[PDB]
């Protein structure tokens, strides 16, 4: 009957009200002890403040762990070993606590007495750092194996999320075993879980052709049952596969499903751009229509994101040069997909103009970064549009304005572009001559 | 010029800020030079300060040398264009030495000894002749 009072205290403890170090230590210890007797619905309610405290004061976490040891003989303790791994900061956490948590996780895996959801919550955050005990994955290579042949459709994501936690797991044969078990349950689909499977498996470049054929076999069902996130993850994983596995007709239904997604995170926009870029060349002539129709609204969405304020997920006050450069580079490589003579899908060039005017409104600061996106200059110049070459001219002119020293190969490439597109500016000419 | 004064104050303090701080200051010098051009003498002072405080990054030295040379060649081109416009419209040893020194100081905004030590520093760093 303590759920309302405890949840109220959890909500209130986020602010710095308690002014005593020992009070904070006791509150953290009590929260760690009591997190083992709540449901998953309240799990985040414990995690969000504690994590903040763990971000605020990682030093007291050692004393909290000393006050509350971890025992692997109780199922309820699983959340205890799952929350803390998320609570500890990825980079601003000391090594001692991380090693102790790693040892506790290894003990819990050896126990095999814990709940699968607890294993998910523990390992999905233990794989964030993976700094110590490289044998973990190898030990995990056995932990998954015991559950390799018993994981159901709703239990496969539990094992796979663990399987994609560490780089040392990128060569685990248990991934192939999981693919074989997916073959065992190919026809049986879970629209909410298949997206999680695709999101987990995209990290590893592994390709099992038969499983992908199975996933794209029932794209008629996925037209309605699959959600937008599941649709984009499945589409990326499918196109990433080999040419033989890809069914040209089947991939059309996923593309039609992803049409009209409205509010989409820019990360999934980048994922879709990479997905279009990772389609085999022989299949492109049969799917120009699909690339074009995806192009149409991808341009609109990126334009909206550029106009949208950064607060709601836009780039109005974008300062991350390394991020905008990657986003725009993927966007223009998506243009590179189409044939030169092929007429660009409508309302896409409007997004191109939006991109160029946004990149021209902020020019001094973009070049001012330690690594300015000079590499975006070829991407602009590969497009047969006057505005793109004009923007490249402006960028090189701004670079001349700073008088930034250039490596000789970059000077030669810029001179090659100068000769190729027959630009007529003089300041660029003088600076390039001086640099050469 | 405020950044130049800041660097001079740090040099007087005999305290070396982090390398990334000096790199940021040099990049701000590069950015701000368009709106307000930086003089040759402040450029020389900043060059001496940056060399003394162990700033390894050669890009700032390249930028400072470019800032000096652009002013020098602009002044030379200005005097040559004045002479060309004029022609289109149309102890003595000690005195000659003084006139040459005055002309050099007018063109370079710097004493000959400091110009020669700048050239020696550039030669030591391996710049092309």
């Amino acid at each position: 009957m303590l759920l309302p009072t405890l949840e109220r205290l959890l909500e209130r403890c986020g602010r710095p009200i308690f002014s005593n170090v020992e009070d904070v230590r006791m509150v953290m210890a009590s929260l760690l002890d009591i997190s083992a007797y709540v449901d998953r619905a309240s799990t985040k309610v414990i995690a969000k403040p504690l994590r903040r405290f763990c971000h605020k004061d990682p030093d007291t976490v050692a004393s909290v762990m000393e006050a509350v040891p971890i025992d692997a003989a109780e199922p309820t303790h699983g959340r205890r070993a799952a929350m803390l791994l998320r609570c500890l900061p990825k980079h601003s956490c000391d090594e001692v606590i991380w090693e102790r948590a790693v040892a506790a996780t290894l003990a819990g895996l050896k126990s095999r007495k814990w709940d699968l959801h607890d294993y998910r919550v523990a390992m999905a955050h233990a794989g964030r750092g993976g700094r110590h005990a490289p044998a973990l994955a190898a030990a995990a290579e056995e932990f998954v194996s015991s559950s390799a042949r018993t994981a159901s459709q709703s239990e496969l994501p539990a094992l796979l999320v663990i399987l994609t936690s560490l780089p040392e797991l990128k060569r685990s044969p248990c991934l192939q075993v999981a693919a074989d078990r997916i073959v065992q349950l190919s026809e049986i689909l879970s629209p909410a879980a298949i997206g999680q499977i695709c999101a987990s498996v995209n990290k590893v470049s592994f390709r099992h052709t038969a499983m992908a054929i199975a996933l794209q076999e029932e794209a008629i069902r996925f037209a309605e049952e699959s959600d937008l996130f599941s649709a984009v993850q499945l589409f990326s994983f499918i196109c990433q596969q080999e040419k033989e596995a890809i069914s040209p007709d089947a991939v059309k239904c996923l593309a039609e499903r992803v049409i009209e997604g409205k509010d989409l995170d820019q990360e999934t926009v980048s994922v879709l751009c990479r997905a279009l870029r990772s389609i085999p060349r022989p299949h492109r002539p049969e799917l120009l229509r699909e690339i074009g129709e995806m192009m149409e609204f991808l341009g609109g969405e990126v334009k909206e994101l550029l106009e949208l304020p950064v607060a709601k997920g836009g780039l109005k006050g974008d300062v991350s040069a390394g991020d905008i450069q990657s986003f725009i580079s993927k966007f223009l490589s998506l243009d590179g997909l189409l044939p030169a003579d092929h007429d660009r899908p409508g309302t896409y060039m409007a997004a191109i103009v939006a991109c160029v005017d946004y990149i021209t409104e902020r020019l001094e600061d973009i070049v001012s970064d330690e690594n300015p996106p000079f590499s975006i200059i070829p991407h602009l110049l590969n497009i047969n549009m006057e505005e793109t070459r004009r923007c490249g001219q402006a960028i090189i002119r701004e670079a001349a304005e700073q008088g930034i020293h250039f490596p000789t190969l970059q000077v030669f490439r810029f001179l090659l572009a100068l000769g190729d597109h027959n630009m007529r500016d003089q300041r660029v000419y003088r600076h390039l001559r001086n640099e050469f | 010029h405020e950044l130049v004064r800041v660097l001079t104050a740090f040099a007087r303090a005999k305290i070396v800020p982090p390398k990334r701080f000096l790199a940021l200051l040099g990049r701000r010098f590069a950015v701000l030079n368009k709106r307000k051009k930086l003089g040759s003498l402040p450029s020389y002072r900043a060059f001496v300060n940056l060399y003394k405080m162990g700033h390894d990054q050669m890009n700032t030295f390249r930028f400072l040398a470019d800032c000096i040379l652009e002013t020098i060649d602009s002044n030379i081109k200005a005097e040559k264009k004045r002479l060309r416009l004029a022609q289109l419209q149309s102890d003595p040893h000690l005195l000659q030495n003084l006139r040459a020194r005055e002309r050099f100081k007018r063109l370079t905004e710097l004493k000959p000894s400091m110009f020669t030590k700048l050239l020696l520093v550039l030669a030591r760093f391996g710049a092309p002749h």
Partner: peptide, 30 residues
């Protein structure tokens, strides 16, 4: 030389002149 700043340049570039001064047979392949 500090002015090079870790840039081999033309002496360490990929130009045909630099690629034409070795006898390996190009068997393994880059």
């Amino acid at each position: 030389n500090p002015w090079n700043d870790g840039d081999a340049g033309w002496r360490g570039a990929a130009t045909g002149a630099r690629a034409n001064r070795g006898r390996g047979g190009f068997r393994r392949g880059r």
